[PDB]
């Protein structure tokens, strides 16, 4: 319901209900793990070799083929069963070459249920009776201060909840131009949210054809591992268009010169360092977690006067989402070549 002659002052940074969304999604994410299986008999001695591949001594194979003792459904008999993992999930314990999982000394990893998926669906947060929600419909609204055209609504619009560290996906596009937002510009410990108008199409794929293999842990307990790699052993990657990326970086340069004067030299360099999922951009392409290198994007300089950027990724199976002290999660392998099309909407 569009209002008249009204003006309220808003503040996105001291706002409530973003904390509530964070707590609700964390607790609901925890709630979809209790019916699923704990990998208690899986933290075990792993006899790993190199994956069968033409080995290059300068590079490294990103797959280790591990066979191990596993308990059958019967408590007396145990079997020898093999699987495939990445370098980023196993570590060498100290001739012989025996490995272990990286989470053997912090937590038992709850295996995610392969029935449930991780695609986003729009949640609308509706207010109870006696409360209302006000949305600001001003175009040039930098998210702080008085907005001149607000309108009340009973429920919010579609919020597809994405898990994206850098380069937020599937967002809400801006109206007519790029808009940068911050709590305090001269504060360099405050992140700057860039939301631009036209979306950037990004394709991402794993071209390696995998085989789901079931292993029986016990009665009613199934462990889904990687079987054979059908075809070529390739590196999973992503693509953006070169021209639209250069154009949109020109757009954010044009908008960034409003806050620092015109005669300013703006350059884009990659992330400085930290863990894996804060220096590289991480996302979830249909129940499969990619960690893609963004050095090919933020590599530019800007003076005050058909191709496509491909970028490689790494694939992890065990995750430590929200960095809890004792809560890790295995992710099951999924069949076939996996590709997804998404829209880069903004930057952090």
């Amino acid at each position: 319901i569009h209002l008249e002659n009204v003006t309220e002052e808003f503040n996105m940074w001291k706002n409530n209900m973003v904390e509530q969304m964070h707590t609700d999604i964390i607790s609901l994410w925890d709630q979809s793990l209790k019916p699923c299986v704990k990998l208690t008999p899986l933290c075990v001695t792993l006899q790993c070799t190199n994956v069968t591949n033409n080995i290059t001594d300068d590079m490294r194979g990103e797959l280790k083929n591990c066979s191990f003792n596993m308990t059958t459904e019967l408590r007396d008999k145990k079997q020898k069963v093999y699987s495939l993992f990445y370098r980023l999930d196993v570590v060498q314990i100290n001739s012989n070459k025996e490995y272990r999982l990286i989470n053997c000394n912090t937590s038992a990893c709850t295996q995610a249920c392969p029935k449930v998926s991780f695609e986003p669906i729009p949640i609308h947060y509706c207010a109870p009776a006696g409360f209302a929600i006000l949305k600001c419909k001003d175009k040039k609204f930098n998210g702080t201060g008085p907005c001149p055209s607000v309108s009340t609504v009973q429920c919010t619009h579609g919020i597809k909840p994405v898990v994206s560290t850098q380069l937020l996906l599937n967002g809400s596009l801006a109206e007519e131009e790029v808009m940068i937002r911050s709590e305090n510009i001269t504060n360099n410990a405050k992140n700057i949210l860039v939301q631009f108008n036209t979306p950037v199409q990004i394709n991402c794929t794993r071209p390696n054809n995998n085989t789901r293999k079931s292993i029986r842990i016990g009665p009613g307990q199934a462990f889904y591992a990687t079987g054979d790699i059908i075809g070529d052993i390739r590196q999973a990657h992503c693509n953006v268009s070169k021209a639209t990326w250069n154009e949109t970086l020109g757009k954010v340069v044009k908008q960034l010169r409003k806050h620092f004067g015109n005669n300013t030299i703006i350059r884009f360099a990659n992330s400085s360092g930290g863990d894996l999922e804060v220096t590289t951009h991480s996302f979830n392409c249909g129940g499969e977690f990619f960690y893609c290198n963004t050095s090919g994007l933020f590599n530019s300089t800007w003076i005050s006067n058909n191709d496509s950027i491909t970028l490689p990724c790494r694939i992890k199976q065990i995750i430590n989402m929200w960095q809890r002290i004792g809560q890790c999660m295995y992710a099951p392998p999924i069949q076939g070549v996996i590709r997804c099309v998404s829209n880069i909407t903004g930057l952090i």
Epitope: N54, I55, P312
Partner: antibody, heavy 132, light 105 residues
Framework: QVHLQESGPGLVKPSETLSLTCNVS????????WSWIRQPLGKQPEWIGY???????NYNPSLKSRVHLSLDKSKNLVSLRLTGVTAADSAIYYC??????????????????????????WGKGTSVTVSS | TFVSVAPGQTARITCGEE??????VIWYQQRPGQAPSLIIY??????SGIPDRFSGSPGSTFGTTATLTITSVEAGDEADYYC????????????FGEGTTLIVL
Amino acid sequence: QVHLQESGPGLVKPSETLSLTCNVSGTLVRDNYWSWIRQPLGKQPEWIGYVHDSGDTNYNPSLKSRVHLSLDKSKNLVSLRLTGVTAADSAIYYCATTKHGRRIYGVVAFKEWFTYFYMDVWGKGTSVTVSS
Amino acid sequence: TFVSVAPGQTARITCGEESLGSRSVIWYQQRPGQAPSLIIYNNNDRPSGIPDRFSGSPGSTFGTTATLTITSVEAGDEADYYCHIWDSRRPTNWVFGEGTTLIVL
């Protein structure tokens, strides 16, 4: 038109350095790759390896030490030296030109391709035999 | 490895290990007493001098054997055949495959 011609001793005493030569006709040593291939009687051939200027001289890792390939740009020939002739070394040997070519299956920038070899023309052979 | 087909008919000669990934096969032939000679240098590519009807299995198939398809055979095709697979997963084959012989009526 190209045709090649080898030459050798034919009779070899054991534990002796074997050496073979390979003539040219038409195309010189600089214009193309070169290769040596050996084959015993009634057997499949064994590609010994390939030789070219600018370090393109990768050898069979089975032998890897007792065999050395070389060129002769002064006289425009190909040459091979062997070390430690055993009884298995009795075979007919071939110098032959070959051509490369990129088989590409994935991304070119991620080195998801390779270079295969194939010998278009061949020599005629030298029946090397080790005996005392 | 003895395959015989009364002349003018078709012919399928298999050779080598089963495929693992993408491959680049090379087919050579060998008359008795002669040097070898190239017939196929790619999965299905031939150079000049050798005619058609010597078709090859494409390397895009996963988990098959390399074949060599010959139609309208003759006494000139009576030779020893050899394969040289170049798989993108297996290492470099410094030796050839197994000798498959063709003989005609």
